[PDB]
């Protein structure tokens, strides 16, 4: 809610609302992700991924990203106050934040014990993605996922944090910044109230620094442009239009 001077009751209500919105749009069930950790790609399966063509691997990954992004769009539409923002600002927030929210949600599917991620039905390491030809970015995403995993977030904490990743009043291009500032502040109050109640305010200092999500997203766009220049037709013919819209 964008309303000023939110009461304690309204703040508590917002905590429950954000968590509900998240639960309804979280894509995969956490319990499924956790119980599948012991399912790991074999050596031959990893080799199979590594022998895939660059275009096929980018095409798969673009599809998986777009799927995840679509659940984040649904999260935004359910998130208290978002649909009351003007449409220009809704688009600015999603165009900038959708990938950031996906990168944060992904820590759910990351196993810090063996540095693997859930991908197409089993867990694999960053060597699974070699055919993309962006090994430095992949390693950086694994590092980011690891940095978040170390905070051992609850699902409620992911709901509240990703709400603030999306509702960021600093995105350039907002036309009604004041309304985003108010929604952001109320969501900060909800996040903080929940953390104070649960003795978890310690995680605030450990959250990703200013610039880190920005860096990962900028590199994604750059590596995509590198790929696209090498394979222009594949993107026009086969990549999801929403993906092309957000990142080309």
């Amino acid at each position: 809610g964008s309303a000023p001077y939110a009461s304690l009751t309204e703040i508590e209500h917002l905590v429950q609302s954000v968590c509900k919105s998240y639960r309804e749009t979280c894509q995969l069930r956490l319990e499924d992700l956790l119980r599948q950790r012991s399912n790991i790609f074999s050596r031959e399966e990893v080799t199979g991924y590594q022998r895939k063509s660059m275009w096929e691997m980018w095409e798969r990954c673009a599809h998986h990203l777009t799927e995840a992004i679509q659940y984040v769009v649904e999260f935004a539409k359910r998130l208290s106050g978002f649909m009351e923002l003007c449409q220009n600002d809704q688009i600015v927030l999603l165009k900038a934040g959708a990938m950031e929210v996906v990168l944060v949600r992904m820590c759910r599917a990351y196993n810090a014990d063996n540095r693997t991620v859930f991908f197409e039905g089993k867990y694999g390491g960053m060597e699974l993605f070699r055919a993309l030809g962006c090994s430095e970015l992949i390693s950086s995403i694994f590092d980011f996922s690891h940095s978040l995993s170390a905070l051992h977030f609850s699902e409620d904490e992911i709901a509240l944090y990703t709400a603030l990743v999306l509702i960021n009043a600093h995105r350039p291009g907002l036309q009604e910044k004041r309304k985003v500032e108010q929604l952001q502040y109320n969501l900060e109050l909800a996040f903080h109230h929940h953390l104070c109640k649960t003795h978890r305010q310690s995680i605030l200092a450990k959250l990703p620094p200013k610039g880190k999500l920005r860096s990962l997203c900028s590199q994604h766009v750059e590596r995509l442009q590198i790929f696209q220049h090498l394979h222009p037709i594949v993107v026009q013919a086969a990549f999801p239009p929403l993906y092309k819209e957000l990142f080309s």
Partner: peptide, 8 residues
């Protein structure tokens, strides 16, 4: 845009 179409 596609975001617009997904949003309205």
């Amino acid at each position: 845009s596609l975001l617009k179409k997904l949003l309205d």
